[PDB]
Symmetry: C3
Subunit: 259 residues, 3 copies
C-alpha cells in the first residue's frame, strides 16, 4: 500500500515494486512488514505463476537496510530489525513461484542480498551492485555471506565482501551474479518477457522444479537425485503432463492449466 | 547391438555412439538396455582408460526421451521408463574411467542430462542444448535439476530449467556448461586427441582423481581433504609413480601400465 | 631464511617465497618458517591482510622441491606431504584474508598454495597447473578439493585428468584467478586491493572470512544460522558505531578492532 506497489495487470504474473524513492528504496521495518504481507498472499495464489521484484524510479533497486533508521536503534532493536530482514529473504526464496529480480539501479548491501534471494536476476546496464557492509564495520546479515559464494564461487564472493566494493552490471554478469544485462529502458520489458515464457510452461512442473533445485543443491548429489525422483512423481498424475504429450502428438503449442 | 555403436579403434579409448539417426538419437527403452549392458562391460575393462560418448550423424547428439514411446504409457510404465533413464545416467557417472561427451548436434532434455553425467563436454559449434522438460509440463527426471546447478550455478540452472529454452554451443560455453567448442567436422578428432592425452597419464592416478573429485565435492572441505589423503596413498606405492619419476629424470615420455 | 616478511603498507604484510634458483619450491625448511610466520600472524592485531608472493619474474611456486624429494622414499614423502597439507590449512584458517600474488609459474603445491588463499591476482605472464596425473600421482595438498569448489567440477576434472598448464588469461576465464594485471603492476595492484580491505572494519572482515569459509561447507539453512551468530560479533563493537558515524560525517572511519 504505502511502501510497496503490486501489479497484477499481466496474466499469471505479479510485479512487486519497492516504493521508497526518496530513501533509495531502502528496507525500513514498515516496508518489510508490507512485503511480508504481500508474500504471504502470493504464497496462496495458485493462478500466480511468476513474480517480478523491482524498485521504483531509475536510481535504485534497493540501497539496503535503512541506515537512518538503523542509526537510531539500540542493540535489541538492531537484532529485531536484522531478524525481520532475514525472515523476509527466506519468504522470497521459499515462494512456490519463481521470483525474478529486475535490478533497475543501485542494489547495495541488503539490496544485493534481496536480489540473491530471488531465483535469478536481470539488471539494467546502469545498475551497480555490491555488499558494502565491511566498509561500515558490519557484515552482510541477511544471507549475503552465504548466498553470494553459492552463486558465484568462494573466491569472487570473498574479494567482493572483504573489499566491500561496488561493481557494474557488466562486471556482475562476468562474475555470474546477474544472469542477464540489458539497456536501461528495456529492463521491465525483458523481465516481463522471461516471466511470460515461464508462465507458459507447466505450472505444477515449474513449482516442483524450483523445489527440487533449491532443496537438492543443499545436499550431496546422491540424496539430491532422490529428491528429484520424488519431485517427478508430482507431475505423473497431472492433466498438464497429458496435454504436453497430446500437443506433441497433435504437433501444436501446448496450453497448460495447472492441474 | 542395433541402437548403439561401440568402437575400440583407438588404443585405451572406447567411443560409444547413440545410433538412431532417424529418431534424432532419442532414448528408447531398447537403446537404454543396450547402453546399460555396454556400460557394465566397460566398468570391468582395465585396458580401457577413457570413454567418449557421442551421437551418430550431424544433427543430433540426443533429442532426449523417446516421446513416441512415452505417449499413452500408464503410470507404472512411466515410473519404469524414468527409472531406466536415471539408472543409465548413474552408470555413466560411476564408470571408473573419465567420460567425455562429444555433442555433435541437438542435446535436449535427457540429451542434456546425458552430457551432464559425463565428466566434461566438447560441443560442435552448431550444437544446441537445454532442459526443455517444463515446456512438456514435466521436470528433468534424470538428474538435470541436480547436475546442472552443480556445474553452472543455481541462478543460471534455474533460468534454463524454468524457461526450458534452447541455447547455442557458444552460450553453453559462456555459462560453463560445455568445456570446449569446435567445428562439427572436427568434433571427433578433438575428442580423440583429448582422450589420448588422458590415456597417456597414469591410469591408477586418473581413476583415483575421478573418485576423489566426484565424491569429495559432495561433502564439506575438511572431509574432502581426508578423502584425497587416502586416495593419494593409492598412488605412492605404484610402479607407475616410479616410471613417472624415472621418465622425468631421463626427460623421455613415461609408459604407464596401470600398476 | 627462505622467506621475507615486510609491511608493504600499514596493516598489510607481504610474505615472499625467496628461493628463485629453485623456482620458489616448497622445501622442508621453507615450510617450517612459513608455518612459523603464520603462527605469529594468527596472534597479531596490526596485520589486517596478508599478500603471499614469490621472488623474481619466473615463478610464484613450482610446488614440491625436486632436488629435496630426489632423495626420498615413501616414508619421507609423507612427512613432506603432511607439512604441505598442514600449511594449506593454516593459510585458509588464518584470521586475516590472504591474497595470492602470482608472479610466474604455479605448479603442484604452488597451485594448491594459491587455492588455499582467499583470492588470487596474477601477472599476465603467470601460468597455473596441476600436472600430477602426467607423473602418475594426484594432487596431494587439496588440489582435487579446492579446485572444483572454485571453478566447478567440469573444468576441475578436465584440468586434473589432462594435467594441463593454463595461462593467466585462461585462468581468469575459468574463475581460477580473480584478477589479471600486467607484470610490472602485480605488486602495486595487490597492495591497492589489500589497502582497501585494511581500511574496512577488522572485526567485520575477520567474521566475514569465517562465515563464508565455514558456511559454504554446509547446507544453506545452517550456513545462514552461522551468519546470524557471526553478525552478533559486530553488533556490540565500537567500530560499528564509528562506521555509522564516519558515514554520517562523510569522512574516513578509524577502526581499532573494538
Ligand atoms: Ca555441499
Amino acid at each position: 500500500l504505502q511502501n510497496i506497489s503490486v501489479d497484477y495487470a499481466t496474466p499469471h504474473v505479479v510485479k512487486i515494486s519497492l516504493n521508497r524513492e526518496r530513501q533509495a528504496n531502502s528496507l525500513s521495518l514498515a516496508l518489510l512488514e508490507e512485503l511480508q504481507n504481500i508474500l504471504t498472499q502470493i504464497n496462496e495464489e495458485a493462478n500466480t505463476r511468476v513474480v517480478i521484484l523491482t524498485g521504483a524510479g531509475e536510481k535504485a533497486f534497493c540501497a539496503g537496510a535503512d541506515l537512518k533508521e538503523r542509526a537510531g536503534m539500540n542493540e535489541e532493536q538492531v537484532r529485531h530489525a536484522v531478524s525481520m530482514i532475514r525472515t523476509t529473504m527466506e519468504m522470497v526464496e521459499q515462494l512456490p513461484q519463481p521470483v525474478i529480480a529486475a535490478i533497475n539501479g543501485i542494489a547495495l548491501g541488503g539490496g544485493t542480498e534481496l536480489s540473491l534471494a530471488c531465483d535469478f536476476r536481470i539488471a539494467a546496464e546502469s545498475a551497480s551492485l555490491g555488499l558494502t557492509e565491511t566498509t561500515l564495520a558490519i557484515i552482510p546479515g541477511a544471507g549475503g555471506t552465504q548466498r553470494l559464494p553459492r552463486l558465484i564461487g568462494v573466491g569472487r564472493a570473498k574479494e567482493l565482501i572483504y573489499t566491500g566494493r561496488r561493481i557494474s552490471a557488466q562486471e556482475a554478469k562476468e562474475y555470474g551474479l546477474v544472469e542477464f544485462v540489458v539497456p536501461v529502458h528495456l529492463l521491465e520489458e525483458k523481465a516481463i518477457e522471461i516471466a511470460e515464457k515461464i508462465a507458459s510452461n507447466g505450472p505444477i512442473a515449474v513449482r516442483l522444479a524450483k523445489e527440487a533445485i533449491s532443496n537438492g543443491i543443499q545436499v550431496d548429489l546422491h540424496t539430491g537425485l532422490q529428491m528429484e525422483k520424488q519431485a517427478y512423481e508430482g507431475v505423473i498424475h497431472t492433466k498438464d503432463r497429458l496435454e504436453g504429450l497430446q500437443a506433441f502428438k497433435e504437433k501444436r503449442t501446448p496450453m497448460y492449466k495447472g492441474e
